Motif scaffolding. Structure first.
Motif, PDB file in Angstrom:
ATOM      1  N   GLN A 106      -1.552   4.394  -1.233  1.00  0.00           N
ATOM      2  CA  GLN A 106      -2.336   5.128  -0.244  1.00  0.00           C
ATOM      3  C   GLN A 106      -1.489   6.171   0.477  1.00  0.00           C
ATOM      4  O   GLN A 106      -1.936   7.307   0.683  1.00  0.00           O
ATOM      5  CB  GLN A 106      -2.955   4.151   0.753  1.00  0.00           C
ATOM      6  CG  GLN A 106      -4.240   3.505   0.270  1.00  0.00           C
ATOM      7  CD  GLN A 106      -4.009   2.478  -0.817  1.00  0.00           C
ATOM      8  OE1 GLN A 106      -2.956   1.844  -0.874  1.00  0.00           O
ATOM      9  NE2 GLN A 106      -4.993   2.307  -1.688  1.00  0.00           N
ATOM     10  N   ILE A 146      -9.156  -1.394   3.044  1.00  0.00           N
ATOM     11  CA  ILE A 146      -8.013  -0.488   3.109  1.00  0.00           C
ATOM     12  C   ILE A 146      -7.765   0.137   1.746  1.00  0.00           C
ATOM     13  O   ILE A 146      -7.877   1.358   1.590  1.00  0.00           O
ATOM     14  CB  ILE A 146      -6.764  -1.215   3.632  1.00  0.00           C
ATOM     15  CG1 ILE A 146      -6.923  -1.521   5.116  1.00  0.00           C
ATOM     16  CG2 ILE A 146      -5.527  -0.366   3.412  1.00  0.00           C
ATOM     17  CD1 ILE A 146      -5.926  -2.501   5.625  1.00  0.00           C
ATOM     18  N   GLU A 147      -7.557  -0.707   0.724  1.00  0.00           N
ATOM     19  CA  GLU A 147      -7.138  -0.217  -0.584  1.00  0.00           C
ATOM     20  C   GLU A 147      -8.203   0.653  -1.247  1.00  0.00           C
ATOM     21  O   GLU A 147      -7.857   1.520  -2.055  1.00  0.00           O
ATOM     22  CB  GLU A 147      -6.691  -1.422  -1.446  1.00  0.00           C
ATOM     23  CG  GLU A 147      -6.668  -1.315  -2.992  1.00  0.00           C
ATOM     24  CD  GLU A 147      -8.028  -1.377  -3.667  1.00  0.00           C
ATOM     25  OE1 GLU A 147      -9.014  -1.704  -2.982  1.00  0.00           O
ATOM     26  OE2 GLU A 147      -8.108  -1.088  -4.879  1.00  0.00           O
ATOM     27  N   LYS A 148      -9.481   0.489  -0.896  1.00  0.00           N
ATOM     28  CA  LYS A 148     -10.479   1.430  -1.396  1.00  0.00           C
ATOM     29  C   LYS A 148     -10.581   2.681  -0.526  1.00  0.00           C
ATOM     30  O   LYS A 148     -10.329   3.791  -1.004  1.00  0.00           O
ATOM     31  CB  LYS A 148     -11.857   0.763  -1.519  1.00  0.00           C
ATOM     32  CG  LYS A 148     -11.894  -0.488  -2.381  1.00  0.00           C
ATOM     33  CD  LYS A 148     -11.884  -0.171  -3.867  1.00  0.00           C
ATOM     34  CE  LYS A 148     -12.646  -1.223  -4.657  1.00  0.00           C
ATOM     35  NZ  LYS A 148     -13.213  -0.683  -5.921  1.00  0.00           N
ATOM     36  N   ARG A 167      -8.339  -6.116   3.410  1.00  0.00           N
ATOM     37  CA  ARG A 167      -7.440  -5.589   2.388  1.00  0.00           C
ATOM     38  C   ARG A 167      -8.197  -4.758   1.362  1.00  0.00           C
ATOM     39  O   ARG A 167      -7.726  -3.685   0.951  1.00  0.00           O
ATOM     40  CB  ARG A 167      -6.693  -6.735   1.711  1.00  0.00           C
ATOM     41  CG  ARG A 167      -5.554  -7.276   2.547  1.00  0.00           C
ATOM     42  CD  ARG A 167      -4.582  -8.094   1.732  1.00  0.00           C
ATOM     43  NE  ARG A 167      -4.851  -9.518   1.862  1.00  0.00           N
ATOM     44  CZ  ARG A 167      -5.569 -10.214   0.996  1.00  0.00           C
ATOM     45  NH1 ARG A 167      -6.095  -9.647  -0.075  1.00  0.00           N
ATOM     46  NH2 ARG A 167      -5.764 -11.513   1.209  1.00  0.00           N
ATOM     47  N   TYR A 213       0.825  -1.212   0.000  1.00  0.00           N
ATOM     48  CA  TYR A 213       0.000   0.000   0.000  1.00  0.00           C
ATOM     49  C   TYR A 213       0.858   1.261   0.000  1.00  0.00           C
ATOM     50  O   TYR A 213       0.701   2.155   0.831  1.00  0.00           O
ATOM     51  CB  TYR A 213      -0.997  -0.005   1.161  1.00  0.00           C
ATOM     52  CG  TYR A 213      -1.816  -1.266   1.177  1.00  0.00           C
ATOM     53  CD1 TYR A 213      -2.487  -1.687   0.039  1.00  0.00           C
ATOM     54  CD2 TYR A 213      -1.893  -2.054   2.314  1.00  0.00           C
ATOM     55  CE1 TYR A 213      -3.225  -2.846   0.036  1.00  0.00           C
ATOM     56  CE2 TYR A 213      -2.630  -3.219   2.322  1.00  0.00           C
ATOM     57  CZ  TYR A 213      -3.292  -3.609   1.179  1.00  0.00           C
ATOM     58  OH  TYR A 213      -4.029  -4.767   1.178  1.00  0.00           O
TER      59      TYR A 213
END
Ligand SMILES: NC(=O)C1=CN([C@@H]2O[C@H](COP(=O)(O)OP(=O)(O)OC[C@H]3O[C@@H](n4cnc5c(N)ncnc54)[C@H](OP(=O)(O)O)[C@@H]3O)[C@@H](O)[C@H]2O)C=CC1
Ligand SMILES: [Zn+2]
Lengths: 114, 95, 134, 340, 126, 208, 86
Positions: C85, G24-26, G21, C82
């Motif tokens: 983000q 989170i990623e969205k 997951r 990630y």
């Protein structure tokens, strides 16, 4: 997992041996305090016998409790005759040893040991 | 060449001595501290330097098999003497 | 002043720059009345009347796992995904870059031997600094 | 604080307890138990002795190597005391004697020597000083023992403001002179008492509990300046106390009264012996003196020591006084004493 | 027949006679010992070792020697594989930490790389 | 290899190999391995269930006649699942030979006593029980023989420390010889003396 | 009193952490924009269960199981613990 036994096939016979040994020890305590001329009462010796029996109360495997029964019978035969001394009998009572810390604070004060 | 501390207790060659506030001095009360006064550093410092005429020399401590293993010392430095590692004797090239 | 221990005097966990957890081992014991650090904090929490729920090192490590599970698996590098983000979040506050050029605090070898309190109290480091400065 | 006085180890024989103690009169009765309890935690113990080293032989195996340092001292030589206490950090004073001899009276062993020891401990910077007085120490007491003990206790308190004064009532133990005196009086007749021994109250204390209280007073920082009173857990009249002593020893017990003026003349006859006297008038007056109660002073319970009653140790004390017929009798086949 | 079905966990803690403070406050360490970097020999990194944690060592008041109160201070054990060490530790009721064996990866050593024509691996001197 | 190399006895090696084949084919129920060492010593490693018939055969057969029990030991190897190895040494006066019989057991499996063959085995396996904890079933008088009267544990087990858990000293308060946890004045300094270079390539174990 | 920090533990390869997951990623960026001063520590591991930790005032901690959740269940759970503050 099939293994050779020692004396008892299952836990009931081992419990029977434990009960018989404890009966014989409870009989022996008055003669032990009489012949060896200990200064403790008979009640104190019987509580010591009960505590030593309760120290091994969490074990459920027949072979190891058979071995402890064998060792206890060995010590009983050792005490029936005068093969122990007064010091060997009173080594079960740790009177000379100072009391150790039990809580966390006293252990933290006394040293680095956990 | 022994040296005495202000507390009156002597100092060995190792430099060990007890402080004034040390409680371990009580083992010497009524008795004495065993200290050897023949300090080896002073006695080896008084040996004359041997002048030789070769680039390399051999040392055995004197006596052959009654001394140390035979070592070889280089004398290519004109600033310092070549000290034997075992007996502490120092040799020097004359050039 | 509370005398603590050192990295050769206690069993303790450290994480390097790559995210790998490792544990030290007790080589010697702290001198005098110096004790372990978590023991000092736990004893303080006991005296102050705010007692913490751990007494042994394994319970403190269980609490460490409870806070972060990657602090109890030693000799293991865990993946950290990630990046997108974090990149999207870092574009919000528009900090302005200064005009000072990037000068590292360690330019020569004399700036290497004295970094922390252990190295500053060493005579070998002092001899090395005196040797490289002359 | 020094690096070599920091405690180390697990409190065993070879450990370091950080206690450097000078115990005076350690070759006596309480000194054996105190040196034994000090040496088993790993303490540096200094023993100044006046007697033969052969009498210090029994004290020799009580501690580790180099932990007991024996040296000579005199009661009328302050320089020897300065030599003894110059390196210690705790000083314990147990100097006493049950009778006055041709060289030392009660004033010397109870006033002069404790004052000299406390003065040279204060001058040497010893932090902890402990003096062992008596519980019934009275300035108006009949016998010279308690008068001199009270005067010496006051002198020690006035010359060492941080001194801890411990006042035991009466000690019973294996090598005591309290239960052994009663068990040996049977040789001379039928145990005479004053007014049948039912007007005096005693509360004896075990020796091991006194030693534990002394050790805890050494360790406790709040015992500095206190004045403890170590007494037993039970109070007995003298008559049934002697009755219990003779019942333990399985000896015939035939008490008879004796007047107070007649007992003093008996104590006069025994105390002319050039050796240690069997009894004296001071021992007579202290035997028939009621132990006072001092509720305002802290006791063994304030130092974490649980008092053990006489019924669990009297047989241990007095088993050597039985004949062959009653040597193997048990704990419980003796009717216990009646308290108040 | 003369065989007993036994299904409980194996323990001999009550038979070994070691006191409880040295059986539940200890911590065994199972590991392949690291190579002594002063030497190139690898014959000492063949067997697993079980050791114990280091407790307090203090100085002797008389002679300055290192006194200790740990009975298990100098006791190590040698095991052929990891599983035998784990079984021995679990049998005696010791909590254990196992650290994996580290073996060196095979390198790519060539003598002709010291004299390359266009690579950076040319030796300055031989 | 004449002056400093010990000469070998090939005749003894061949004869002991022949007798090992003989024994291993006479008793196929118990014999697991037969090995003759380079100094001509025979080892018959059997199953623990066959302790009594193998020893009876070696004592009573006309071609073995191993009438003497010279020595009976026990060896602890902790890495095995049967950590105890019991070793019998037998001497034949008629044929003038020595044989070794090895078996295995762990802490909880009892071993059949061999007092019915040799009567010195009584004291020998009594000592083995004292020093290792190996229980010998159907034994006449099984007690301790070398350790202290109140001693707990078995000293020759490899997990037992060199210094015991207790030590004895005389205490004057109880006037008795009491036992306390051990505290060495100087610790036993452990020395690491293993060379990291291989000495004997003939004993090289294969890799994993 | 109120909420001090949020800890979200999950795995990168397990299918039980699939919903976490995805969540989170969205939606993590706009969650962080919603709560800029609230530390929401994301911790990935190898063989752990999806778990949600909330720290409250004076050290009170609360636990929410997140095993076999979809992303929508995860974000109702997170708005629940955000709006609780107890
Ligand atoms: N009855 C009791 O037990 C009680 C005693 N106390 C007090 O406790 C203290 C200890 O009593 P305890 O141990 O039973 O008696 P002891 O007589 O058995 O011991 C007294 C010690 O003092 C030494 N001493 C005596 N006179 C001198 C002197 N002039 N110079 C130097 N040393 C001397 C003795 O040594 P040496 O052998 O060389 O003469 C001995 O070691 C005394 O002060 C006593 O008053 C308090 C309450 C009860
Ligand atoms: Zn030389």
């Amino acid at each position: 997992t099939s293994v050779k036994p020692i004396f008892s096939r299952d836990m009931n016979e081992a419990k029977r041996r434990v009960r018989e040994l404890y009966r014989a020890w409870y009989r022996e305590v008055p003669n032990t305090v009489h012949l060896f001329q200990l200064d403790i009462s008979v009640k104190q010796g019987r509580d010591k016998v009960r505590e030593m029996f309760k120290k091994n109360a969490h074990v459920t495997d027949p072979r190891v409790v058979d071995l402890l029964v064998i060792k206890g019978k060995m010590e009983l035969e050792e005490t029936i005759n005068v093969w122990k001394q007064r010091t060997h009998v009173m080594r079960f009572f740790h009177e000379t040893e100072a009391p150790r810390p039990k809580d966390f604070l006293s252990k933290f004060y006394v040293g680095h040991d956990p | 060449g022994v040296r005495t501390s202000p507390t009156g207790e002597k100092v060995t060659h190792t430099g060990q001595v007890y402080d004034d506030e040390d409680y371990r001095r009580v083992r010497f009360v009524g008795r004495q501290k065993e200290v050897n006064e023949n300090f080896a550093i002073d006695l080896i410092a008084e040996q004359p330097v041997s002048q030789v005429g070769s680039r390399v020399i051999s040392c055995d401590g004197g006596g052959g098999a009654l001394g140390h293993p035979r070592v070889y010392i280089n004398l290519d430095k004109e600033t310092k003497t070549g000290t034997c590692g075992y007996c502490g004797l120092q040799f020097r090239q004359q050039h | 002043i509370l005398p603590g221990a050192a990295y050769t005097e206690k069993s303790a966990t450290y994480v390097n720059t790559e995210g790998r957890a490792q544990q030290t081992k007790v080589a010697v014991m702290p001198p005098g009345l110096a004790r372990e650090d978590w023991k000092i904090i736990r004893a303080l929490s006991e005296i102050a009347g705010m007692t913490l729920p751990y007494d042994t090192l394994d319970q403190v490590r269980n609490r460490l796992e409870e806070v972060s599970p990657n602090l109890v698996r030693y000799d293991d590098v865990e993946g950290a995904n990630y990046f997108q983000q974090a990149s999207e979040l870092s574009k919000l506050v528009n900090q302005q870059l200064l005009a000072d050029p990037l000068v590292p605090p360690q330019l020569t070898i004399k700036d290497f031997y004295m970094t922390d309190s252990i190295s500053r109290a060493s005579q070998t480091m002092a001899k090395c600094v005196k040797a490289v400065t002359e | 604080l020094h690096h070599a006085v920091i405690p180390h180890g697990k409190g065993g024989r070879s450990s370091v307890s950080g206690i450097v103690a000078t115990v005076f009169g350690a070759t006596g009765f309480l000194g054996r138990y105190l040196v034994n309890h000090l040496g088993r935690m790993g303490s540096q113990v200094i023993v100044p002795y006046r007697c033969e080293p052969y009498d210090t032989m029994h004290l020799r195996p009580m501690g580790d190597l180099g932990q007991i340092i024996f040296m000579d001292w005199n009661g009328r030589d302050k320089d020897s005391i300065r030599r003894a206490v110059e390196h210690s950090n705790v000083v314990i004073n147990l100097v006493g004697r049950e009778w006055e001899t041709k060289n030392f009276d009660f004033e010397d062993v109870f006033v002069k020597i404790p004052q000299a020891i406390a003065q040279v401990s204060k001058e040497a910077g010893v932090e902890k000083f402990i003096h062992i007085s008596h519980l019934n120490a009275d300035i108006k007491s009949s016998s010279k023992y308690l008068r001199n003990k009270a005067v010496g206790e006051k002198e020690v308190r006035e010359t060492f403001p941080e001194a801890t004064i411990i006042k035991p009532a009466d000690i019973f133990g294996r090598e005591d002179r309290f239960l052994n005196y009663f068990a040996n009086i049977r040789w001379f007749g039928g145990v005479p008492l004053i007014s049948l021994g039912k007007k005096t109250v005693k509360q004896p204390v075990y020796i091991v509990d006194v030693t534990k209280g002394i050790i805890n007073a050494i360790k406790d920082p709040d015992a500095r300046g206190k004045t403890f009173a170590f007494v037993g857990p039970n109070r007995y009249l003298l008559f049934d106390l002697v009755q219990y002593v003779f019942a333990v020893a399985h000896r015939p017990f035939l008490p008879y009264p004796m007047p107070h003026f007649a007992y003093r003349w008996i104590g006069r006859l025994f105390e002319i012996s050039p050796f240690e006297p069997w009894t004296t008038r001071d021992k007579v007056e202290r035997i028939h003196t009621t132990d006072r109660t001092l509720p305002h002073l802290p006791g063994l319970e304030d130092l974490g020591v649980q008092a053990t009653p006489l019924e669990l140790k009297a047989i241990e004390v007095l088993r050597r006084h039985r004949t062959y017929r009653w040597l193997s009798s048990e704990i419980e086949d003796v009717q216990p004493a009646k308290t108040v | 027949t003369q065989l007993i079905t036994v299904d409980e966990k194996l323990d001999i803690t009550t038979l070994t006679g070691v006191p409880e403070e040295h059986i539940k406050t200890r911590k065994a360490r199972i590991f392949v010992p690291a190579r002594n970097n002063m030497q190139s020999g690898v014959n000492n990194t063949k067997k697993w070792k079980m050791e114990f944690d280091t407790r307090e060592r203090w100085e002797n008041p008389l002679m300055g020697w290192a006194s200790t109160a740990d009975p298990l201070s100098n006791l190590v054990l040698t095991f052929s594989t990891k599983e035998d060490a784990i079984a021995f530790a679990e049998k005696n009721g010791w909590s254990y930490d196992v650290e994996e064996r580290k073996v060196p990866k095979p390198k790519s050593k060539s003598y002709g790389a010291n004299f390359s024509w266009n690579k950076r691996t040319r030796v300055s001197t031989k | 290899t004449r002056p400093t190399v010990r000469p070998r006895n090939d005749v003894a090696h061949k004869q002991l190999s022949a007798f090992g084949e003989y024994v291993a084919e006479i008793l196929p129920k118990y014999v697991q391995q037969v090995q003759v060492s380079c100094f001509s010593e025979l080892e018959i490693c059997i199953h623990p269930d066959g302790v009594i018939p193998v020893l009876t055969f070696l004592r009573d057969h006309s071609n073995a006649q191993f009438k003497s029990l010279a020595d009976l030991t026990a060896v602890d190897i902790p890495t095995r699942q049967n950590r105890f190895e019991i070793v019998y040494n037998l001497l034949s006066l008629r044929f003038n030979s020595r044989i070794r019989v090895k078996t295995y057991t762990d802490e909880l499996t009892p071993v059949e006593s061999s007092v019915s063959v040799y009567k010195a085995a009584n004291w020998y396996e009594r000592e083995i029980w004292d020093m290792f904890g190996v229980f010998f079933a159907n034994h006449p008088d099984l007690r301790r023989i070398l350790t202290d009267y109140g001693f707990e544990g078995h000293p020759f087990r490899k997990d037992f420390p060199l210094s015991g858990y207790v030590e004895l000293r005389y205490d004057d308060e109880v006037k008795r010889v009491v036992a306390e946890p051990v505290e060495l004045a100087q610790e036993f300094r452990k020395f690491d003396l293993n060379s990291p270079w291989e000495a004997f390539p003939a004993y090289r174990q294969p890799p994993e | 009193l109120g909420l001090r920090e949020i800890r979200i533990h999950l795995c990168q390869r397990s299918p039980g952490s699939q919903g976490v997951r995805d969540f989170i990623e969205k939606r993590y960026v706009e969650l962080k924009k919603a709560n800029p001063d609230l530390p929401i520590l994301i911790r990935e591991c190898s063989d752990v269960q999806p778990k949600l930790w909330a720290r409250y005032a004076f050290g009170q901690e609360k636990n929410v199981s997140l095993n076999n959740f979809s992303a929508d269940q995860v974000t109702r759970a997170l708005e629940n613990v955000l709006s609780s503050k107890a």
